[PDB]
Amino acid sequence: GADSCKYCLQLYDETYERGSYIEVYKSVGSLSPPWTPGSVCVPFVNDTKRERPYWYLFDNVNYTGRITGLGHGTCIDDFTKSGFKGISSIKRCIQTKDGKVECINQ
C-alpha cells in the first residue's frame, strides 16, 4: 500500500478524503486554471524532525486572496464549503516544535 507519501499536500477530488488526489511537494505561485479539490489533507508527521508541514492554500495567485492553512494530520471534510474551492496558488510552510510557521516563498 503506497497510498501515503511523506511531506506532501494532497488534494482530493471529492470531499471527506475521497476521490483521487494529487501530490504536491512544493509551492505553486500560479494555477491556471485554479484547482478545485473536494477536500484537502496534510499527512501526519510526528517525525523526529524539527519541522512539521503546514500547508497554505490561496484562492488567488501569488499567494493572495483567501487563505487556508492546514496542518499535519488534519484534513478538511469539505474544502468547497469552507469558503473557496478553487486554489489559485499554494504555499508550503513548515511549523517547527516551537510552533513558529516559517514558509518558503517560491
- Output the 3-class SS for 39-57: EEECCCCCCCCCEEEEEEE
Cβ(29)–Cβ(61) below 8 Å: yes
Cβ(55)–Cβ(90) below 8 Å: yes
Cβ(22)–Cβ(10) below 8 Å: yes
Domain chopping of the chain, boundaries: 1-106
Which residues have a C–N gap over 2.5 Å right after them in the chain? none
Q: Can you tell me the distance from the alpha carbon of 34 to that of 97, in angstroms, rounded to the nearest whole number?
A: 32
DSSP string, 63-106: TEEEEEEEETT-B-S-TGGGS---BSEEEEEEEETT--EEE---
The grid coordinates listed for 74 are: 488534519
Q: Does CATH number 2.30.40.10 belong to domain 1-106?
A: no
Q: What are the b/e assignments for 61-83, b being 16+ CB within 10 Å?
A: bebeeeebebbbeebbeebeeee
